[PDB]
Structure 1
Amino acid sequence: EVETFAFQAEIAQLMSLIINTFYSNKEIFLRELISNSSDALDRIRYESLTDPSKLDSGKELHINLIPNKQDRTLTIVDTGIGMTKADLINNLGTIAKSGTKAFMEALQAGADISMIGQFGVGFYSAYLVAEKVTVITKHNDDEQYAWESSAGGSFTVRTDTGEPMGRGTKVILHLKEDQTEYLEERRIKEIVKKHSQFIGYPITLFVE
């Protein structure tokens, strides 16, 4: 049972801007996703101070980067706090509406796409390099879901039938045909070193 949803017009507008604007420095997507993973790892660590039981779904706090040339995917995996169905359908968009407006205001005033993370919507920078994004996520006290969107104004949510994760989020980037450089070990290493070098969690780059 797959549910189909329309993005708020403001989010659809943001995604179109990311897809349509000529902007050569696409590699910033990876910093934005790693930063989101780090923040989600922080969140579950903090929650666990008052309530140790929230690590019952996994004590290890880390990030994996998994390239796959057969599937033409780059997956960013974390064991952070995860997202609920209510998040995927309602709450993320509610919060992202404000950040999107500020970001577009800043772009008018002369900012560039590389500062998107200051507005809380760096996730959508995935669409610089991906034709489709699939998000697998599991939050304590909710089920594992698959969110998916190829932009175009809509997204889908299903209960995920795949391998159970425990707790956390997988962002699966289905890369555009001309963006397969982000599957190459040397390129990913370069980018993580340049932009994500002080992240306070292990980042494991899987080999093909």
Structure 2
Amino acid sequence: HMKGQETRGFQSEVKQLLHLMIHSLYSNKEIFLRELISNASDAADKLRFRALSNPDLYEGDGELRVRVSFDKDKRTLTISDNGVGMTRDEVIDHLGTIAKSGTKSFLESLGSDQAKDSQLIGQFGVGFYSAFIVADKVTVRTRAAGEKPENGVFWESAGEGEYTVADITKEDRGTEITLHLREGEDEFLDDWRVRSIISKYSDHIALPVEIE
């Protein structure tokens, strides 16, 4: 049910950093939940700012939140928001490149001293690609506020050297991120553990989180 399927390569620096991050941040692997929930919260803020000049962007779905769900059989964790969403060009510009400034130096500054690592991670957002610390496949389904449902976007990657993008019909506004968990990462199928991790981060993040 996809149209315009295209494979694109990660930029070289991005590819190398992704690979380094999976190792260097493993002792703080739960940080991906901070990163994805933070992104949902920003997406909600963006929707609200845009909606100032166009109330219809709420689409009658005004209660903004992020929903977390689990599939034990498929070994997936899904983080889904009804924030601003992304167009195809936004997906390519933001999830394609995504060479976050300072990331290289940040990762190189991590090491065996867990106290220094915790201090660093507390001060720097690694972003979306943190998902690959715990997941061997990440799939995004998104549809931007005000856009026709037929102009949704699919994005998928194994976090190696490429991703695939396509057009999809997505009736609901926002971004749904599905993580297929790596072997050994069943921690993130435990609703209590995930709720607990998120609650600690939710002290600084301003968007309601619903754990299914």
* 1:13, distance to aligned residue in structure 2 (A): 1.4
- 2:44 aligned partner, one-letter code: L
Counting only pairs closer than 5 Å after superposition, residues 37-76 of structure 1 correspond to structure 2 as 37-56=40-59, 58-76=61-79
Residue 130 of structure 1 aligns with which residue? 135
Q: Compute the RMSD of aligned alpha carbons.
A: 2.3
* Structure 2 partner of 1:107: 107
Deviation of the 1:165 alpha carbon: 3.8
**Unaligned residue ranges in structure 2 (runs of 5+):** 111-115
What residue is the counterpart of 2:200 in the other structure?
194
Number of residue equivalences? 200
Question: Percent same amino acid at aligned positions?
Answer: 42
User: Could you list the runs of 5+ residues in structure 1 that have no partner in the other structure?
Assistant: none
Deviation at 1:63, TM superposition (A): 0.6
The secondary structure found in structure 1 opposite 2:84 is coil
Q: Among residues 150, 157, 160, which one is paired with 2:168 in the alignment?
A: 160
Q: Give the superposition deviation at 1:144.
A: 1.1
**CA distance in structure 1 between the aligned counterparts of 2:173 and 2:82, rounded to whole angstroms:** 6
Q: Distance in 2 between matches of 1:58 and 1:130?
A: 30
Question: By how many angstroms is 1:57 displaced?
Answer: 6.3
TM-score, reference length from structure 1: 0.86
Cα separation, 2, equivalents of 1:180 and 1:92: 26
User: CA 1:69–1:198 in structure 2 vs 1: closer, same or farther (change >3 Å)?
Assistant: same
Instruction: Say which is worse superposed, 191-200 or 74-83, in terms of deviation.
Output: 191-200
SS of structure 2 residue aligned to 1:80: coil
Report deviation, 1:23: 2.7
Using structure 2 for the length normalisation, give the TM-score.
0.85
1:40, 1:193 → 2: CA distance? 19
Partner Cα separation in structure 2 for residue 107 and residue 82 of structure 1: 29
**Mapping 1:73-92, distance limit 5 Å:** 73-92=76-95
1:34-82 alpha-carbon deviations (Å, 9 max, x no partner): 0000000010011111221211263221110001101111000000111
Summarize deviations over 1:70-117 as a string: whole Å, max 9, x none. Answer: 1111000000111110012235445x32x24x1212333557486398
Partners of 1:84 and 1:117 lie apart in 2 by 30
Question: 1:70/1:165 Cα in 2 relative to 1: closer, same or farther (>3 Å)?
Answer: farther
Please state if 1:184 is matched with 2:180: no
How many angstroms does 1:27 deviate by?
Answer: 0.7
2:211 equivalent to 1:205: yes
Structure 1 CA distance for aligned equivalents of residues 37 and 43 of structure 2: 10
How many angstroms apart in 1 are the aligned matches of 2:57 and 2:9? 32
The residue aligned with 2:144 is 139
Structure 1 CA distance for aligned equivalents of residues 207 and 26 of structure 2: 30
Q: Does 1:9 align with 2:9?
A: no
SS at 2:52 equivalent: helix
Name the structure 2 match of 1:32.
Answer: 35
